[PDB]
Amino acid sequence: VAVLYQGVNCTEVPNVFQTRAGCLIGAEHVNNSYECDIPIGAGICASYQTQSIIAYTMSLGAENSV
Amino acid sequence: AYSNNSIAIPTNFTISVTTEILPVSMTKTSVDCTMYICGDSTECSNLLLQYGSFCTQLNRALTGIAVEQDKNTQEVFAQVKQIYKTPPIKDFGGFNFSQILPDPSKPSKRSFIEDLLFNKVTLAKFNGLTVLPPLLTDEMIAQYTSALLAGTITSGWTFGAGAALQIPFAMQMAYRFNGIGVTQNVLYENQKLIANQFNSAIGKIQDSLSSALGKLQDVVNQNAQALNTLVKQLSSNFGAISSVLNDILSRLDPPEAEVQIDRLITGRLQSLQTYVTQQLIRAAEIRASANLAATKMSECVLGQSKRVDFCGKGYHLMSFPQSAPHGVVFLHVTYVPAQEKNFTTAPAICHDGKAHFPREGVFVSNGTHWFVTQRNFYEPQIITTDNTFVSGNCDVVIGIVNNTVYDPLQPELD
Amino acid sequence: KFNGLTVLPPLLTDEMIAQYTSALLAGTITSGWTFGAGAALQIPFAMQMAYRFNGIGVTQNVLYENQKLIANQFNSAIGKIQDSLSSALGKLQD
Amino acid sequence: QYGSFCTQLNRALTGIAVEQDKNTQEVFAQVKQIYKTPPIKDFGGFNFS
Amino acid sequence: RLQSLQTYVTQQLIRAAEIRASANLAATKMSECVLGQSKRVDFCGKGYH
Ligand SMILES: *[C@@H]1O[C@H](CO)[C@@H](O[C@@H]2O[C@H](CO)[C@@H](O)[C@H](O)[C@H]2NC(C)=O)[C@H](O)[C@H]1NC(C)=O
Ligand SMILES: *[C@@H]1O[C@H](CO)[C@@H](O[C@@H]2O[C@H](CO)[C@@H](O)[C@H](O)[C@H]2NC(C)=O)[C@H](O)[C@H]1NC(C)=O
Ligand SMILES: *[C@@H]1O[C@H](CO)[C@@H](O[C@@H]2O[C@H](CO)[C@@H](O)[C@H](O)[C@H]2NC(C)=O)[C@H](O)[C@H]1NC(C)=O
Ligand SMILES: *[C@@H]1O[C@H](CO)[C@@H](O)[C@H](O)[C@H]1NC(C)=O
Ligand SMILES: *[C@@H]1O[C@H](CO)[C@@H](O)[C@H](O)[C@H]1NC(C)=O
Ligand SMILES: *[C@@H]1O[C@H](CO)[C@@H](O)[C@H](O)[C@H]1NC(C)=O
Ligand SMILES: *[C@@H]1O[C@H](CO)[C@@H](O)[C@H](O)[C@H]1NC(C)=O
Ligand SMILES: *[C@@H]1O[C@H](CO)[C@@H](O)[C@H](O)[C@H]1NC(C)=O
Ligand SMILES: *[C@@H]1O[C@H](CO)[C@@H](O)[C@H](O)[C@H]1NC(C)=O
């Protein structure tokens, strides 16, 4: 599982990744961007794609130039 | 002036651009039953523990509203999967979309008019009353709107049914005119004028906005008013000696304190339930408005619309979407007839015992001749066998006149 | 009215609504739809009906060669409505 | 000392009150020119008496 | 008497929302059937309009 402490500064603690949604604990941060699997918030989603949990930034879609 | 042999055709046409505003969602909140009702005391929590499962029921309702908000935003905007980009070359036959395209200089990729709309709703945590972030950041919505604009200008409607097909802009406008019953050559022979009209109209919108957004303001005002009432309601006695549970932790022992703690509990439950109910009704209303906004998005913008007064007053030509805080804005580009002239008419012309009718136009006469013209634009043409069609004998039609049809075959036979 | 329970008048008196409806009727009969997009353009009534037929895929000469019959049909139908009403309004009653 | 429930109620009721006027305005006020029919009644045999 | 007043107000709010929906639909009929000819089936009576 992963845990989310909403509204709390990550530095204050009762793998840590500070999202605007709140200090996220237990998951890893990557640099890719895929479809959104489950919504965390504030433009950040997460998934069990790779096995551990990852939290990534959702990407709207593939790109083309007519 | 209605007379049984008179009609009034326009001569000139005027473009126009009109704005429209819609709300799409509200600001999501979540509340703590225990923190609001009891503060922090153990005794109050112990006494509430037996009232029921009202707290849990409330939380379920509030989270339901929360998730519908994300669905509303998703539905209104996420209708395209390819994030198109405009080409650096800007040649659209004289049209000028500088204003409502993305300007790559500002940090937030917002167009000029989007930026103006943003700076008009200035909006006017310590009790268990939390607000939560939306799912999509504003840059994402900006990207979606930019993609829609690129799609319409470079591909017409054809991106909304399948793969994005390119086509110049002049012929897209020509097709859109043909779709309201005005032939193509009308557009072609006047392109410079339509271009100037459109530029001036968009400039006037840009000016008028920087003066208007009541519909998007009332939502914020209602939200803030409700929260202020729900918070201010914590300073009434509801029939106790005081309105602070710390004023009751002291100066009393449990046996006779519990009755006043009871009265405070009752008051604060009743306040919470009123807040939740009114919120549910408001959310349903916004849900209705968001469904309507998605429908406009999918009918006016994705393709041309034809149902009257659905995408602005006047015959509809196209639309452009723009964003705004917690809402969407439409710019409907539409068409209007300007300068009228009176002409005399007649249903059919009997050349030689045969009733000739117009294929798609209507017969007009400036007093000296007969021409046949299209319905919405005065453009005379001469009667031929390639322009009418026959039926019966000219004896049953209530209105008939006498004229000869040119029939361009006889002279050529030599 | 004697307990703090007040009713209030609407904004528009019924004559005003009557005027609005009369205006709409005048617009449709004397100008077709063209008053709903811009200036009111006049056009006889026979050709307005002809255009409305053409808009559902029935050519114009169909209307023209039978105008007296459409007129009688319409009169009889409106008379039957006038009779049937004077007999029905549950939706407005509830 | 019960609270501001009265004021809250009054605000709700007045909200309904103003929406009523907006509904009537929207359904009917769609024309700005108050046209008049001509005294001549010749519509090809139709009869709008 | 507080409890009675609140029940009355709530039911009134729900009814008003329903009438609001009906009035939007009526305005749409007014603006599509009357102002111009309509073409979407079964929106302005049974049969071609
Ligand atoms: C249709 O209306 C437009 C709007 O006035 C006319 O355009 C003007 O034409 C005059 C004379 O050609 C110019 O001096 C003006 O500068 C034009 N307007 C603008 C904004 O530039 C147009 O001429 C009209 N159509 C016809 C056939 O006369
Ligand atoms: C109605 O339009 C016709 C066509 O333009 C006018 O007839 C022309 O008039 C000019 C000026 O006298 C002549 O030079 C042309 O040779 C005429 N052409 C034809 C085919 O007749 C006519 O004068 C117009 N009538 C009115 C009352 O304006
Ligand atoms: C169109 O021309 C025809 C051919 O002359 C007209 O038909 C005759 O009109 C006169 C008018 O007095 C009648 O007396 C004749 O009985 C008609 N029939 C024939 C076979 O000559 C017709 O009336 C003209 N239409 C008009 C003037 O509106
Ligand atoms: C969290 O605390 C650090 C200092 O410990 C501070 O620099 C940072 O701005 C804080 N962030 C938030 C969101 O409070
Ligand atoms: C992700 O990007 C940041 C900065 O671009 C970099 O420091 C980091 O090493 C990158 N991580 C991976 C896994 O690529
Ligand atoms: C378009 O409008 C902008 C804004 O006034 C102007 O700077 C520009 O020169 C116009 N023309 C083109 C081709 O961009
Ligand atoms: C046509 O002429 C009549 C003359 O009485 C006038 O009343 C009417 O306004 C005119 N209409 C147009 C469109 O020129
Ligand atoms: C049109 O009305 C006039 C009355 O001014 C009448 O003389 C004429 O016969 C009418 N024509 C038709 C076709 O009804
Ligand atoms: C129209 O109907 C009315 C009502 O029966 C009748 O009095 C009148 O004669 C009819 N015809 C005309 C032209 O008004």
Residue numbers in the entry:
A (entry chain A): 608 to 621, 641 to 676, 690 to 705
B (entry chain B): 706 to 829, 854 to 940, 944 to 1146
C (entry chain C): 854 to 940, 944 to 950
D (entry chain C): 755 to 803
E (entry chain C): 1000 to 1048
Article, verbatim:
The spike glycoproteins of coronaviruses are responsible for receptor binding and membrane fusion during the initial stages of virus infection. The spike proteins of most current severe acute respiratory syndrome coronavirus 2 isolates contain a D614G substitution, by comparison with the spike protein of initial isolates. Viruses that have spike proteins containing the amino acid substitution D614G are currently predominant in the severe acute respiratory syndrome coronavirus 2 (SARS-CoV-2) pandemic, and it has recently been shown that G614 viruses have higher infectivity and produce higher viral loads than D614 viruses. In this study we present high-resolution, single-particle cryo-electron microscopy structures of the G614 spike variant showing that it adopts a predominantly open conformation, unlike the D614 spike that is mostly closed.
